[PDB]
Amino acid sequence: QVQLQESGPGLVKPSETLSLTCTVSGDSVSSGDYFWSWIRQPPGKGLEWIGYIFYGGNTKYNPSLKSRVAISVDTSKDQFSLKLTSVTAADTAVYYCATSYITGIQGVDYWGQGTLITVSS
Amino acid sequence: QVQLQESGPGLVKPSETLSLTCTVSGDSVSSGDYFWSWIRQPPGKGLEWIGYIFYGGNTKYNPSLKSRVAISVDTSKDQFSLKLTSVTAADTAVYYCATSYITGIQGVDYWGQGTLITVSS
Amino acid sequence: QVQLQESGPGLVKPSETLSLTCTVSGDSVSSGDYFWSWIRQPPGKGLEWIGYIFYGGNTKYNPSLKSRVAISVDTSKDQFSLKLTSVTAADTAVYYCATSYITGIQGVDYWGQGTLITVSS
Amino acid sequence: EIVLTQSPGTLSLSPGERATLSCRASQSVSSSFLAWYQQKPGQAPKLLIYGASSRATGIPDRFSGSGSGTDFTLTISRLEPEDFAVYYCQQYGYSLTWTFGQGTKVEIK
Amino acid sequence: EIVLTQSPGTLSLSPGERATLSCRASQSVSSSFLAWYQQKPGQAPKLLIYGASSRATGIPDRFSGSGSGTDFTLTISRLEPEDFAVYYCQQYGYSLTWTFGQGTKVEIK
Amino acid sequence: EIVLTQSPGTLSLSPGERATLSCRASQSVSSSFLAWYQQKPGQAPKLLIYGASSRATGIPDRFSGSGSGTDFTLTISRLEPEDFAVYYCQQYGYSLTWTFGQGTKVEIK
Amino acid sequence: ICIGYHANNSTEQVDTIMEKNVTVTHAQDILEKTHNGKLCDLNGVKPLILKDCSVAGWLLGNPMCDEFIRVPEWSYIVERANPANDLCFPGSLNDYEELKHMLSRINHFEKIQIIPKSSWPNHETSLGVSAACPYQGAPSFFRNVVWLIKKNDAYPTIKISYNNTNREDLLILWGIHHSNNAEEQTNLYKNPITYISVGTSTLNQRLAPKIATRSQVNGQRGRMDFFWTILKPDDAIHFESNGNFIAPEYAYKIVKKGDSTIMKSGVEYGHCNTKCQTPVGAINSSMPFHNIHPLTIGECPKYVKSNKLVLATGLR
Amino acid sequence: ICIGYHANNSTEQVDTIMEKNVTVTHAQDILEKTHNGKLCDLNGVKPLILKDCSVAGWLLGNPMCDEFIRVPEWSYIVERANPANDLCFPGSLNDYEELKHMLSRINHFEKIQIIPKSSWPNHETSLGVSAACPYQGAPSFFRNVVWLIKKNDAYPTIKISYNNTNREDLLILWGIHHSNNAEEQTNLYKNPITYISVGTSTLNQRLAPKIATRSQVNGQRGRMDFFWTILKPDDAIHFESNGNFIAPEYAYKIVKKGDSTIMKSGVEYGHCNTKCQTPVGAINSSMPFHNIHPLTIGECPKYVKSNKLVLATGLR
Amino acid sequence: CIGYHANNSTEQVDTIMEKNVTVTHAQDILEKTHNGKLCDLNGVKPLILKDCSVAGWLLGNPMCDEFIRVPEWSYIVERANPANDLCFPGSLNDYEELKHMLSRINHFEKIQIIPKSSWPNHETSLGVSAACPYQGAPSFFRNVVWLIKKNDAYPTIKISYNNTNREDLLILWGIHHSNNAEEQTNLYKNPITYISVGTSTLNQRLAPKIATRSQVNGQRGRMDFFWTILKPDDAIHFESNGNFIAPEYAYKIVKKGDSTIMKSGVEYGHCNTKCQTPVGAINSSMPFHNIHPLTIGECPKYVKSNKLVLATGLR
Amino acid sequence: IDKMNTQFEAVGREFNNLERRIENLNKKMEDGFLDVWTYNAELLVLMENERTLDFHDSNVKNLYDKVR
Amino acid sequence: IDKMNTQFEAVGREFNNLERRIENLNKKMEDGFLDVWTYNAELLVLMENERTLDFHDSNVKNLYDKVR
Amino acid sequence: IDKMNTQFEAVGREFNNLERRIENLNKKMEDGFLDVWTYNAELLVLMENERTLDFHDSNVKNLYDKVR
């Protein structure tokens, strides 16, 4: 079992980057049996996928945001963070932290709590 | 577990032979742990013994019907048959197929259904 | 499990010795996991310790009755006997037979039944 | 040829009582090589007791038996309306002569 | 890009009856790579059914599910004062495009 | 020579209440090497509590105990008709000084 | 006057390192190539000969091999390759090779009855026959071991022990039985979960049966496992079993002091004396090299794999 | 007139036992110390070359060893020292060395489908992938075995068998999985207590999983155990499992005529014809001694550990 | 005149065709002399155990308390059938492999890996036995702890140790087999027990056996011991429910080389040599001998002969 | 000729099918000893006969030159 | 020179970590055979070259004294 | 005489009572090597003395006939 917590900054000026962090408790981030993913949700609309990173350095992305996506991990303080650039007005994110099994994959089950990021000048 | 079935002619002229067939379902005739036997029952009289055959080619017979009896085994169509010759008028009775264990013998467990054979001219 | 029985003589003239026996039924006296001991109890007073013997030839003694005490064992008749010497007026004792475990020692749990000894001229 | 005979010929009992069916022998047979059967018309005999007093699977607790040496004795405890058939003694063994008996029957009082 | 459309728009039911929420598809999705979720406001959607009908640990014995090939379904059996949320389809797999749907909501009659 | 003194001399109680029999010491003894007994006239004293506080197989739930370091206690919880006897402390160990106490008694109020 | 020349006749051509064909006279050989193709005796003590049975079949009392009861003392064993009878009931004997190695060269062999057949008042000892080990048309079983089944309807727990009061070591064999399914067990041993526990002063063991479906060998879908031990002139052996027990009846008395091997051959017997024996035949040669057969028992000359070890002492 | 002489202008000094250094004309050597550093054929038949996989990874279908799908008969094996890929999932193969000794010198290798993937109606065969054996960024698993998972909520008992109808032997592999706790089990196989059982006409077996906490290798905290067997032309194999089963898909068909060993080196391939091969390089000499490398496959001259074996035929 | 003469000495030798010729100032290449004393190898001094076995020394036999520690050595000297050995009957799993490995250890040191105060919910005092006495009172081993129920129970043990040093370790532990069902409840309340030990390359599970056995040293119970080695980053994990003999001390080794054991009872000496025989020490230069086949080090060959004398001499 | 000799070398083949490596070790040892003994035996003669014949050829002339 | 020879002596090292004793046995066997063959090879030349220089230097004078 | 030698053979006996076949293998190996070395040493000394002694013999006579 794992628990997640994200926090992260808030308002950000246009035409610059964005940054979150996600810290985990319980099992380690070198677990090698999980799908550390990121999922966004435009307010008033449906959900969406961005990409996940699993053990090693392997990664995948959604072919709509592909250019401006970067997911990285750091085993020291048990975190994995996201760096999205070229921010426009249509990039309000409620970015979620999600996990999923890799063998006998079931639906994604353990998720965080949610944080609002609003972009404006 | 075994189930037996028998069928044969219902009238046979004197001084000729006599034939029957016994077909088994479930296990095989080559089980090697059974006593395939034959039993008679004159109407209005008691039971009797004719002989049995077990794994290999070994066999034994009654000291009354000895020179006119024979039991054979065929492993293709799961059958064993009996051929009684030199028929007399006093050999009309019901006929039975029987089976028994060989290690830890506990009598006769399973039986056929019966058939009537009457001899005359 | 063990049961004990002691019996023994009742009256002994002064300046002589004192001899008791203790038979053991069930587990052998060569067990190697018990503390065969002797415990006295002057009438109208408390209890006290005399000494025990365990597997081998190892014994220990109370530093009150030390010179005039000896405990010995034999394996033939499954007995261990006590030989108190230099008897005095203040040596009346209801000698007991007690047993205890050696590994994971708990309180003494199996005791004998009691025998009264009086010393006088 | 170990001939086995059943002492009673025909027993008529009202429901409730017990039967004392007993079959003796000519040569003393062991107690590990005997069996009892029940014969209803049409079908084939089935097994009730094997050994000397051991019970066969499925047989109710009312059926009991005893005996050793040359004399044996079957005993049903209570009479239930269904119990009306013909029984056979058998001397199965490795003596190479399996001899049955002449049988016995029970019917309404 | 496997687009999934949920045919019902909004269902208004009194307590007691059952819901027949469906979920079509653009390409034939397997029956081993589909799930359902329940989204209450604020926290998150959570798992109910995975694959075709396997319920999730803790889900009560009232949620069913059928369908295969391209047209799946859902059922809530009996209505209780709790069932007021928004449900989302998913197509988790190894096709590298995890596409959700647009949602469906139910509320009091 | 470790001398053990039992503080109560004589206790008279009506049925129902609890006893606070204690057992001081001269030199501090451990808690794993001390036990309690119960002596009825004639046969012998038996085992009640072994260790600091741990009941012996067969001992009822009423009998408890507590204490550590140099000051141990005991309790009978509820007084029942049977319980009236003389109790002894012990210092069983591997210090070669197995000394009992002077005892304590309890009788009717 | 001259010198030499006395060679006149015979023809015993031989060779050297730097010249390959010289006619040397009154030559000699130290290669062993002639032999008496017959099995014979080793230093007085006669070997043991089993005609058409295996060691395991002999020690366990095969019903098809009952002529071998008296075996006082021997040196080696003659066992024909691919023996026919063997274990009539399929299974295995644990540590067969160690027993085969040790059983050679026994200086005292004797049979004793350690547990009589009247020592089981509450079990059955007569309904233990099988169709894979027949005897004159009637089914039978081994003779040195007893297969126990339920007596009335039950298999009471067995607690038996034996104390060695003789002055010699003994050899004891017992076993376990593996059923086919769960229906077979009830008709033989009422209990569904069983075990065996055997303990001595230097031994500890616990076993449980295996139940599964396997193939058919000799009309039996079941197996049988056997074991052995050796106890000392003062020790004791204890048993305990809830089911599937092949109890011992006879145990042997041995003295040891030696080790040898087993000969696999089929040659005839004869009257003779020697020091070493080859599977094809015997030999009584003192020359240091031979050619016949590598595998041997006893003290034998060396193997060279050659035909022409001629040395000679002739002039010219 | 004299006799002898005809001294040349060479220099081939050699040694004796009572004298050390003398000039020998037209000497000769019988010491093999030259060679070619390449790997070539053995009497025509060509060896098997695995570049960066182990035998236990080739015989099971490592995802990053897919180049080896079909290979005909061979003589020996070349395996690089400390190979990288190996078993992606941590574990062990039972009796690895016996199999490694067995696989050398196989005279017929082939692949057949003995259990098709459509023969599991009531189970799942598509969710058995792991992140320790990736394939182009997506997790994968072996290709010769199937990891079985519950279908709806259940793992019903598997009772399957295969009768060998071909006229050749076969090699079969399977395995068992060891969980890391009591929740992974219920998330994979509903049954908490499991077993497997395998039975042939000569083999009996029963195993159970082990549940505990261990350290981390390659991310995972679990292990796998693999086994093997050989069945005869007309025998059969039977399986029964309640959980933790790695079912077989393909089996290998062999005939066998001998045995050899494996070679650990990293030299390039060549085209020659030699009787024997050395790990550093090939050799095609007839002289009876050498000093290159002791380990060898085939008939090779002796090892002497010397540099100056010169015999010669020189006057003066 | 001509010829060479001699009139001195008497040493007869034999050849392939003659058998007795008088050879003057012969010489021998057969080693048949020796000093009957045990001495030291090339620098590293041997390990001497007087009346103990390897298992008794490693596990801390009470009667062999003198051998507290030794820095380093080459081989081992041990008498035939040493008297002390294991005081409690039982066995050590893979004893011969351990004895093979212990020979030629180039660093040895004792460290406390689990302190005695890290068992707050268990009893570690009253774990003594009467088959291992000490000065007339019962005792037990020193490097291992026999744990039994503290208050009335025996909670599950989950302990782990991380090898933070820069050297390997050798760790020992064990299991106990009882006599009957009534004995276990007196020590461990739980009737059905197990142990489970797991490392990176190890996986093991055990369970005790309960039965009736004979009497050896006044006990009908047995004990079994095991061992393992872990690396400078590995971690060892333990899990027990009963019948556990937990470790207290471990050992540090560097493990470069191999040797064998020596069985003899000769006295110690001060020498320097290359090879040693169980009867004495030899400084060998001839290539043959007949003293004793078993040896440690570089030694000449065994010939089983007494008359190797060739040298040289006229007439 | 009985200069040196051996004693009581019992030889056999007692190994099951799961111990092929030890059987290979035994076969290698036997083949090696075969090689050593065949080389020694077939080379001892090639030098014994030469010196034997040279003995004969040397004496058949030295006894002649004794006559002086 | 091919007076003796061997056949198919395939060798290797296929032993586990818990079977160190059998590996030691194999190493001892290999070292022993190495010693036997190095002694035999280093002695079959030292005694051969000397006797090689026997009818190399003796015939030189006997063919001389043939002239009489 | 120190022409070729050996290197660090550690010899012992480490086998229990259920591994008697491997002990027999070890004993056979040791007996074989003993036989090889005893034959080699005895024959080496037996042939070395003869050549030593006739080297000691022919030299003095050729020293004599140097005087021609």
Question: Can you give chain E as a three-state secondary structure string?
Answer: CCCCCCCCCEEEECCCCCCCCCECCCCCCCCCCCEEEEECCCCCEEEEEECCCEECCCCCCCCECCEECCEECCECCCCCCCCCCEECEECCCCCCCCCCCCCEEEEEC
Tokens representing H12 are: 């081939």
Exposure string over D82-105, b if 16+ CB within 10 A, otherwise e: eeebebbbbbbbeeeebbbbebbe
Q: What's the sign of the alpha-carbon dihedral L31, L37, L40, L41?
A: negative
Residue B67 contacts by C-beta under 8 Å, 6 or more apart in sequence? B86
H219 shares its domain with H176: yes
Collect all residues of chain G within an 8 Å Cβ-Cβ radius of residue B103: 127-131, 188
Q: At what angle do helices K20-43 and I95-102 cross, to 10 degrees?
A: 50
Distance from CA of G246 to the nearest CA of J (A): 26
G9 shares its domain with G154: no
> Tokens 């009582």, residue?
D17
Q: How far is CA A118 from CA A40, A87, A92, A111, B81, in A?
A: 13, 11, 6, 21, 93
Distance, CA of H301 to CA of H217 (rounded, Å)? 45
I133 shares its domain with I89: yes
Do K26 and J55 touch, CB atoms closer than 8 A?
no
Q: What's the gap between Cα G181 and its chain centre?
A: 34
* Of the partner residues D32, D53, D55, the one whose CB lies closest to the CB of residue G127: D32
What's the burial of L35, exposed, middle or buried (CB within 10 Å: 0-12/13-18/19+)?
Answer: buried
Do I84 and I56 touch, CB atoms closer than 8 A?
yes
Does any CB of chain I come closer than 8 Å to the CB of residue G199?
yes
* Of the partner residues A32, A59, A105, the one whose CB lies closest to the CB of residue H132: A32
Q: For chain I, what is the radius of gyration of the CA atoms?
A: 28
Question: Cβ of K24 and I258 within 8 Å?
Answer: yes
Do K49 and H16 touch, CB atoms closer than 8 A?
yes
Do H55 and H83 touch, CB atoms closer than 8 A?
no
Residue I102: helix, strand or coil by DSSP?
helix
Domain end: H248, H263, H278, which one?
Answer: H263
Residue F46: helix, strand or coil by DSSP?
strand
Chains in contact with K, counting 3 or more C-beta pairs less than 8 Å apart as contact:
H, I, J, L
Distance, CA of E29 to CA of E11 (rounded, Å)? 26
Beta strand B71-74 with B79-83 is antiparallel
Pick left, alpha or beta for residue F64 (phi over 0 → left; psi -120 to 50 → alpha; otherwise beta).
beta
Collect all residues of chain A within an 8 Å Cβ-Cβ radius of residue H188: 103-104
Chains in contact with B, counting 3 or more C-beta pairs less than 8 Å apart as contact:
D, G
Residue H222 contacts by C-beta under 8 Å, 6 or more apart in sequence? H90, H177, H178, H179, H180, H184
| CB count in 10 Å sphere of residue I77 | 20
DSSP structure class, residue G44: T
- Which ranges of chain H does DSSP label H, i.e. alpha helix? 55-58, 96-103, 182-188
G21 shares its domain with G73: no
Collect all residues of chain C within an 8 Å Cβ-Cβ radius of residue I129: 102-103
What's the burial of A118, exposed, middle or buried (CB within 10 Å: 0-12/13-18/19+)?
Answer: exposed
Distance, CA of G300 to CA of G303 (rounded, Å)? 9
Q: Do chains E and H touch (3 or more CB pairs under 8 A)?
A: yes
Nearest to I202 by CA among H130, H175, H213: H213
- List, edge to edge, every strand of the sheet that includes H48-50: H48-50, H77-79, H262-263
CATH of the domain at H289: 2.10.77.10
Query: What's the one-letter identity of residue D88?
Result: Y
Distance, CA of H74 to CA of H109 (rounded, Å)? 9
Residue H146: helix, strand or coil by DSSP?
strand
Beta strand F89-90 with F104-108 is unpaired
Q: How far is CA I20 from CA I5, I12, I308, K64, in A?
A: 19, 6, 14, 38
DSSP structure class, residue I311: -
| Domain range for G15 | 1-39+268-316
CA dihedral C102, C106, C109, C110 (to 10 degrees): 0
Which residue, among I156, I161, I196, would best test binding to H if mutated, counting the most H CBs under 10 Å from its CB?
Answer: I196
For chain I, count helices (H), then strands (E).
Answer: 3, 25
Distance, CA of H283 to CA of A83 (rounded, Å)? 61
Query: What's the one-letter identity of residue L1?
Result: I
- List, edge to edge, every strand of the sheet that includes A36-40: A48-53, A36-40, A96-99, A110-111
Q: How far is CA G24 from CA G7, G10, G12, G309, J45, in A?
A: 9, 9, 5, 14, 13
Q: Do chains K and I touch (3 or more CB pairs under 8 A)?
A: yes
> Tokens 């017992």, residue?
G174
Do A68 and A79 touch, CB atoms closer than 8 A?
no
Nearest to I123 by CA among I191, I58, I186, I209: I186
- Which ranges of chain I does DSSP label H, i.e. alpha helix? 54-58, 95-102, 181-187
Do F105 and F86 touch, CB atoms closer than 8 A?
yes
Q: What is chain F's percent helix, strand, coil content, to nearest 5?
A: 0, 35, 65
Strands (E) located in F1-109: 10-13, 22-23, 35-39, 45-50, 64-68, 71-75, 86-87, 89-90, 104-108
Residue F46 lies in a domain: yes
Residue H82 contacts by C-beta under 8 Å, 6 or more apart in sequence? none
CA dihedral J54, J58, J61, J62 (to 10 degrees): -170
> Tokens 């960066």, residue?
H52
CA dihedral H87, H88, H91, H92 (to 10 degrees): 0
- Chain B and chain G share a number of CB contacts under 8 A equal to 41
Exposure string over I182-209, b if 16+ CB within 10 A, otherwise e: ebbeebbeeeebbbbbbbbbebeeeebe
> Tokens 């060691």, residue?
G55
Distance, CA of K62 to CA of K68 (rounded, Å)? 10
Q: What's the gap between Cα A88 and its chain centre?
A: 18
Report the number of distinct structural domains present in chain I: 2
Distance, CA of F67 to CA of B105 (rounded, Å)? 69
Q: Do chains A and E touch (3 or more CB pairs under 8 A)?
A: yes
Distance, CA of H267 to CA of I63 (rounded, Å)? 60
Collect all residues of chain K within an 8 Å Cβ-Cβ radius of residue J35: 4, 6
Nearest to H112 by CA among H248, H315, H291: H248
Domains of chain K (ranges; CATH) run 1-68 (3.90.20.10)
Specify the length of chain B in residues. Answer: 121
Nearest to F23 by CA among F108, F99, F77: F99
G285 shares its domain with G208: no
Nearest to A98 by CA among A45, A57, A58, A47: A47
Collect all residues of chain I within an 8 Å Cβ-Cβ radius of residue G229: none
Beta strand G138-140 with G130-135 is antiparallel
Do G89 and G220 touch, CB atoms closer than 8 A?
yes
CA dihedral J1, J5, J8, J11 (to 10 degrees): -100
Query: What's the one-letter identity of residue H68?
Result: F
Q: What is chain L's percent helix, strand, coil content, to nearest 5?
A: 70, 0, 30
G17 shares its domain with G89: no
Distance, CA of I246 to CA of I144 (rounded, Å)? 6
Residue I40: helix, strand or coil by DSSP?
strand
- Direct distance between the N- and C-terminal alpha carbons of chain H, in angstroms, rounded to an integer: 18
H246 shares its domain with H312: no
Q: What's the sign of the alpha-carbon dihedral C19, C23, C27, C29?
A: positive
Does any CB of chain L come closer than 8 Å to the CB of residue K30?
no
CA dihedral H134, H135, H140, H142 (to 10 degrees): -100
CATH of the domain at E8: 2.60.40.10
Pick left, alpha or beta for residue F56 (phi over 0 → left; psi -120 to 50 → alpha; otherwise beta).
beta
Q: What is chain K's percent helix, strand, coil content, to nearest 5?
A: 55, 0, 45
Report the number of distinct structural domains present in chain F: 1
Beta strand B36-41 with B93-98 is antiparallel
Distance, CA of I236 to CA of E106 (rounded, Å)? 55
Q: For chain J, what is the radius of gyration of the CA atoms?
A: 23
Q: How far is CA H203 from CA G84, H237, H249, in A?
A: 22, 9, 21
| CB count in 10 Å sphere of residue I1 | 4
Residue F27 lies in a domain: yes
CA dihedral G121, G127, G129, G135 (to 10 degrees): 90
> Tokens 């003869």, residue?
L50
Query: What's the one-letter identity of residue J46?
Result: L
Domains of chain C (ranges; CATH) run 2-119 (2.60.40.10)
Distance, CA of I238 to CA of D46 (rounded, Å)? 60
- Direct distance between the N- and C-terminal alpha carbons of chain J, in angstroms, rounded to an integer: 38
Upper half-sphere CA count for residue K60 (Cβ side, 13 Å): 12
Q: How far is CA J57 from CA D101, J54, J60, in A?
A: 108, 5, 5
Residue K27 contacts by C-beta under 8 Å, 6 or more apart in sequence? none
Method: cryo-EM
Upper half-sphere CA count for residue D24 (Cβ side, 13 Å): 3
- Direct distance between the N- and C-terminal alpha carbons of chain B, in angstroms, rounded to an integer: 41
Distance, CA of G290 to CA of B13 (rounded, Å)? 79
Distance, CA of B8 to CA of H68 (rounded, Å)? 63
Distance, CA of H111 to CA of H248 (rounded, Å)? 12
3-state secondary structure chain A: CEEEECCCCCCECCCCCEECCCEEEECCCCCCCECEEEEECCCCCCCEEEEEECCCCCECCCCCCHHHCCEEEECCCCEEEEEECCCCCCCCECCEEEECECCCCCCCCEECCCCCECECC
Nearest to G96 by CA among G256, G237, G225: G225
Does any CB of chain A come closer than 8 Å to the CB of residue H129?
yes
Helix (H) or strand (E) holding H27, with range, is none
Tokens representing J28 are: 């290698």
Question: Cβ of G127 and D53 within 8 Å?
Answer: no
What's the burial of K14, exposed, middle or buried (CB within 10 Å: 0-12/13-18/19+)?
Answer: middle
Nearest to L30 by CA among I298, K32, I97: K32
Residue F1 lies in a domain: no
| Domain range for E54 | 1-109
Strands (E) located in chain D: 4-6, 10-13, 23-25, 34-38, 46-51, 54-55, 63-68, 71-76, 86-87, 89-90, 104-108
Exposure string over H218-231, b if 16+ CB within 10 A, otherwise e: ebbbbbbbbbbeeb
Strands (E) located in G43-144: 48-50, 77-79, 92-93, 110-113, 130-135, 138-140
Do A6 and A113 touch, CB atoms closer than 8 A?
yes
| CB count in 10 Å sphere of residue H284 | 13
G154 shares its domain with G249: yes
The DSSP-derived string for I228-287 is EEE-TT-EEEEEESSSEEEE-EEEEE-------EEE--PPEEEEE-SEE-SS-EE---SS
What's the burial of D59, exposed, middle or buried (CB within 10 Å: 0-12/13-18/19+)?
Answer: middle
Distance, CA of D58 to CA of B109 (rounded, Å)? 12
Residue I207: helix, strand or coil by DSSP?
coil
Pick left, alpha or beta for residue H38 (phi over 0 → left; psi -120 to 50 → alpha; otherwise beta).
beta
Nearest to G260 by CA among J12, C25, H32: J12
Nearest to I186 by CA among I146, I149, I151: I149
Q: Which residues pair with E68 in a beta bridge?
A: E71
G114 shares its domain with G12: no
Q: Which residues pair with I38 in a beta bridge?
A: I268
Query: What's the one-letter identity of residue D40?
Result: K
Q: How far is CA I86 from CA G204, H182, I101, K37, in A?
A: 18, 39, 20, 47
Distance from CA of L1 to the nearest CA of J (A): 22
Q: Which residues pair with G206 in a beta bridge?
A: G197
Q: What's the sign of the alpha-carbon dihedral H114, H119, H124, H125?
A: positive
